[PDB]
Ligand binder design. Structure first.
Ligand SMILES: CC(=O)OCC[N+](C)(C)C
Ligand SMILES: CC(=O)OCC[N+](C)(C)C
Ligand SMILES: CC(=O)OCC[N+](C)(C)C
Ligand SMILES: CC(=O)OCC[N+](C)(C)C
Lengths: 537, 535
């Protein structure tokens, strides 16, 4: 050193770091990218819990994103931005346990509230390095310290032989928890306040956040929580120990691995790509919005099912912001429901709808699927292909996201939590998906992170202002447990969600509007009636 | 001797009576026998045609009311008593009534035949609300109404027996219908233009005549108000009628072997039979009736469901409808928490318990499905919502969805169907406001009672009754309730399975709506049965 920018040199527990001055529209920010927080989970360490990173000598370069965790790469629409923006943007490697930090430049002189991002992608994909997760805007405009981590996905993250030592399951969640521990020890070196840490995440990232809420060793590592379009409860976020065993064993067979020790040892000899090549061959039914390797109810990380834990938990101390986008299901329809495509209007027949329901509600008996169809049919125009297309989307959206979230918000509020709920209804003007998909899963993230503030991205002026409002809600919540601006009143208030009033807000170009009841009639169908059909048949 | 009031029918001569309607005279012939009294050994038996008589039969007065249960829930209260017998009870009750214009119509006039309701356990053609005076005077209609046997007398069946074969009260109706074919021309009626109409059990009866072949050559058009042959209450199986008859017999000390059991039942005074009429139902219930038409494989060759699903209805015109609050009336007759004397604000607990009684045949799982569907999840515990939903459950299950199913099957199988919902609450109604527009309270408007100034209806209601009398009689004339001279009201379109159009009848002009409680009736008509099947 001696000739470098003295504001980019920072020491952490493992040693010295050098970061990079980045440009944001309104001025510079500090970034520290690819900081290792675990020993590379390679070789004999595959499937194993992470071990904390051993200290390095000299100055670690933290100026570039590190490798993305080994994962399936989407091939449905090759060249198409709508899917490619979610694809890995760095080399795939099992050596991938790194985190990123953005802070004001120069670094804040007083302890600053910290936001920790956890990406989604079904627990089989994702990366903290994608463009839509760029922390520079929140850092620059809000003065926030933003942290994001890679965590293992797919088999590498979630393959489990429950009860074994060598593959106990949930290790991707343990990667996440280790990064939270890293923030506790080190974030003050960056001017971050370890006593004000807010988790946020979308989809599987949101289920992750919820699992940290429900897991006692994680509880002391953060203070507030944001869950966007995902929950730890519901039909996809977890599996039974028995089902996890069954999927691990089948995958083992499919790659030529015929006592748990022997089987796991043989899996550890397999090239990473082989595991990925076979990970979609283990699902019990033809399905969408189901993922092969996900958190498992081990009776350890998750001491009971997420359902049981939200029903009996004490959440007096907790503050949560939860919400959904207007069209949660539409995205998933093109990945497996015959009749659906990005390249046409996807008008479908009644027959194609009944077939779609079986794929979208894969665990449903015949009677249960008939209930779904009868509920979502418009009996005034039962054959209308536009209505049938839109109902198919709502089925998948309600079943996997909207009603799981409605449930969570009710259970948390009944048991002491301060809960704020939203529905995000603005379709980005630069969206490349067709109009029929409305406001698809994942397409609020862009706005929360402040991308429209970059003039080179071609968003409208209104979108720029709208993004600034949302960043303000998110960071006000991180800061105080309350998204409302303390100073400004009469400009509409966001009231807490309660069981008695069921209030939530619309997020769009218009000022906040307060609505009551989150899909209340339909979610009574999913959350109260459908289960009772099962546990009686 | 007024020559207008003197008629020769096939069985001899009759003398009627000049009655006064607000607009002028009408001729009435009340208490005309159409069958041999069904007494002694004829109890439970099909009716026999009335033997000829000498001289002039006096037909100036209503005859006895068929022997039936008399309501005692609210003694002296007009809202219940208006349906109670207004003449003496007697098993000797097979008589009918004819109103015609005065003077007698110069050319053959369309004929309307009224069939009363009363759950198949009660009713009479002599009630004030069934007065044919107004329709005769204003519309020039020939109006006919009969007594038919109710309760055990009309519907106690031991299926396959010769002495108590079931459905005799429907056969009573059929005989009155045959009498109209043979005799109505002498009164100026057109036997080639006969429209049946009826309400509740009367509408179910009209529907049973639609579904029974020997009845079909006896009328040309049909109106079913608030009732259907299909649904949960209008019929029972042979097995279930046998059981109820066998149980009642046991309760009155009779006696194994049909002949013997039926002979012993015939020795029993009428009131002994009625005394135990309400001790044979399988469940604690409301909107259920002990003795009703039976699926005998004869009058009804298969179930009403089977017959409407497979029938050919191409030559048929039908008018069907419901009132806005079909179920409210019934709740005070057995659902804890409900009374006419207060607002009936109930708890959630009272709502779940109320559902088991309103849907008595429902399994635990089906009951929950109903509760979950009718709960408003924004206001799950609000007493006003819970009360109104209880009413709605009972109305939909028993009348609205049964009607929606019938309307749909008829339209699809070639019938011409017009549907309505009746939404005006009579200003003179003695029932409380929370009951809204209850089961049975459209009848007085269609019969035209608001036209009697002594009765204290509003001017609005008089104009409104005139509109309804016109739709009903237009329908009788042509099979289309639209006025063929008026150039738009707007027009009442036919009900079809595609468009599902029906009209609201109230003080405002006709409004066309689409879909008769479509989402909720899918639940009852499509989902609940599938829940029955698999469980
Ligand atoms: C988008 C999505 O959920 O993909 C799952 C199906 N897959 C991985 C085989 C394409
Ligand atoms: C649907 C899926 O599996 O991945 C898309 C990326 N996501 C969920 C973060 C928007
Ligand atoms: C009013 C009604 O339909 O109930 C009949 C049975 N009752 C009155 C004997 C209890
Ligand atoms: C209590 C009962 O079932 O009958 C009421 C009279 N009715 C049905 C003609 C309106």
């Amino acid at each position: 050193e001696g000739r470098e920018d003295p504001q980019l040199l920072v020491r952490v527990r493992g040693g010295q770091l050098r970061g990079i001055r980045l440009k944001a529209p309104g001025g510079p920010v500090s970034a520290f990218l690819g900081i290792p927080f675990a020993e590379p989970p390679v070789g004999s360490r595959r499937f194993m819990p992470p071990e904390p990173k051993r200290p390095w000598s000299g100055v670690l370069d933290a100026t570039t994103f590190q490798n993305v965790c080994y994962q399936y790469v989407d091939t449905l629409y090759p060249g198409f931005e709508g899917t490619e923006m979610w694809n890995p943007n760095r080399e795939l490697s099992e050596d991938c346990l790194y985190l990123n930090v953005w802070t004001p430049y120069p670094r804040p002189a007083s302890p600053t509230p910290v936001l920790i991002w956890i990406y989604g992608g079904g627990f089989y994909s994702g990366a903290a390095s994608l463009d839509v997760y760029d922390g520079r805007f929140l850092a620059q405009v809000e003065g926030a310290v933003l942290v994001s981590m890679n965590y293992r996905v797919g088999t590498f993250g979630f393959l489990a032989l429950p009860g074994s030592r060598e593959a106990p399951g949930n290790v991707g969640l343990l990667d996440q928890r280790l990064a939270l521990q890293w923030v506790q020890e080190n974030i003050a070196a960056f001017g971050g306040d370890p006593m004000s840490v807010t988790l946020f995440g979308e989809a599987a990232g949101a289920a992750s956040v919820g699992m940290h809420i429900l897991s006692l060793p994680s509880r002391s590592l953060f203070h507030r929580a944001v869950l966007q379009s995902g929950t730890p409860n519901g039909p996809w976020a977890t599996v039974s120990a028995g089902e996890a065993r069954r999927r691990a064993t089948l995958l083992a067979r499919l790659v030529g691995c015929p006592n748990d020790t022997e089987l796991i040892a043989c899996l550890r000899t397999r090239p990473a790509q082989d595991l990925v090549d076979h990970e979609w061959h283990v699902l019990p039914q033809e399905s969408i919005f189901r993922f092969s390797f996900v958190p498992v109810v081990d009776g350890d990380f998750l001491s009971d099912t997420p359902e049981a834990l939200i029903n009996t938990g004490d959440f007096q101390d907790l503050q949560v912001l939860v919400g959904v986008v207007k069209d949660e299901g539409s995205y998933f329809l093109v990945y497996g429901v015959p009749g659906f495509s990005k390249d046409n209007e996807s008008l479908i027949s009644r027959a194609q709808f009944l077939a779609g329901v079986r794929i979208g509600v894969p665990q449903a008996s015949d009677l249960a699927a008939e209930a779904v169809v009868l509920h979502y049919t418009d009996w005034l125009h039962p054959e209308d292909p536009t209505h049938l297309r839109d109902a198919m989307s709502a089925v998948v959206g309600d079943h996997n996201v909207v009603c799981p979230v409605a449930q969570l918000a009710g259970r948390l509020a009944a048991q002491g939590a301060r809960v704020y709920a939203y529905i995000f209804e603005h379709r980005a003007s630069t969206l490349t998906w067709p109009l029929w998909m409305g406001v698809p899963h994942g397409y609020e993230i862009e706005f929360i992170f402040g991308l429209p503030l970059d003039p080179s991205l071609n968003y409208t002026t209104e979108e720029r202002i709208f993004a600034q409002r949302l960043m303000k809600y998110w960071t006000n919540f991180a800061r105080t447990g309350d998204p409302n601006d303390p100073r400004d009143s009469k400009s509409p208030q966001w009231p807490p969600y309660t069981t008695a009033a069921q209030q939530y807000v619309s997020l769009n170009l218009k000022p906040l509007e307060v609505r009551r009841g989150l899909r209340a009639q339909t979610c009574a169908f999913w959350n109260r009636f459908l289960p009772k059909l099962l546990s009686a048949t």
